């Protein structure tokens, strides 16, 4: 029989924006490549103590710096890299987890940890630019965002996007909010939630968040906007995976990315 196997690329994009100046944008993208095996394998490997070699290739591998291969399972060319998995250590590992997690239907294993070479604001899926105008008893906030297709290999939506920003100065009331937000009085912060941002969004993916605050113990000190969002269907790196040799097929290759530490200063 030929064994089903699964694969996931999961990337975190960290970004820091400074006012409206793109040159001052610091970006850092990291990722994990994970393989997954179905329970059956244990039995399967019991059948055969000399199984078919698990060998794969990463495509667009040159887009990665700082690559750490799983020390127990790997590592010992230009734009592709090939790997031969250590089968005795994998069989061992998978036996151990199966014995401790007997009701598990599948087992994930970390294969590769890496960085993705990122070139400034171009590598960033949600361009951001914040401006504060802080008056003694007043405060105006503006956030400008632009969905950026260039950052990702295939054009995919950004989901569950959150814009959180703390507001100093002793806020007493907010006016002129657009689109609607939520005020958290206890933490003294404002939160905008947008369910989806894509090319097929209300405005092409490009829009503004506005707010005005009245103060009693002003003026307020500008604070970092923190952003959250996830995404399924595409990498930032452009990596894919191929199986080389016989004995296994990919049942599924999951690609996805997410905001990690994603901020905007004044």
């Amino acid at each position: 029989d030929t064994l089903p196997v699964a694969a996931a690329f999961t990337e975190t994009v960290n970004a820091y924006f400074k006012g409206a100046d793109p040159s001052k944008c610091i970006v850092k993208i990291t990722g994990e490549m994970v393989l997954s095996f179905p329970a059956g394998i244990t039995r399967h490997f019991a059948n055969n103590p000399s199984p078919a070699a698990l060998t794969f290739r990463v495509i667009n591998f040159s887009r990665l710096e700082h690559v750490l291969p799983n020390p127990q399972l790997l590592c010992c060319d230009a734009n592709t890299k090939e790997f031969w998995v250590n089968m005795p250590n994998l069989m061992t590992h998978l036996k151990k987890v199966s014995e401790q997690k007997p009701q598990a239907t599948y087992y994930n294993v970390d294969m590769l940890k890496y960085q993705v070479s990122a070139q400034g604001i171009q590598s960033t899926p949600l361009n951001l630019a914040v401006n504060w105008r802080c008056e003694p008893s007043s405060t105006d906030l503006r956030i400008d965002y632009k969905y950026n297709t260039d950052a990702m290999t295939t054009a995919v939506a950004l989901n569950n996007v959150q814009f959180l920003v703390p507001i100093d100065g002793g806020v007493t009331k907010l006016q002129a909010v657009l689109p609607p937000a939520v005020w958290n009085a206890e933490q003294q912060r404002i939160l905008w939630k947008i369910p989806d941002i894509s090319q097929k969004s209300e405005n092409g993916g490009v829009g503004s968040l506005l707010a005005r605050f009245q103060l009693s113990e002003g003026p307020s000190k500008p604070s970092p906007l923190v952003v959250q969002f996830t995404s399924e269907g595409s990498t930032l790196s452009g990596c894919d995976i191929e199986l080389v040799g016989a004995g296994y097929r990919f049942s599924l290759i999951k690609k996805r990315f997410a905001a990690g530490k994603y901020l905007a200063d004044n």
Binding site: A6, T10, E32, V34, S36, P38, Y106, N108, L252, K254
Partner: peptide, 10 residues
């Protein structure tokens, strides 16, 4: 964290 958010095999 599970990148498959469930069973990828069925």
């Amino acid at each position: 964290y599970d990148p498959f958010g469930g069973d990828p095999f069925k």
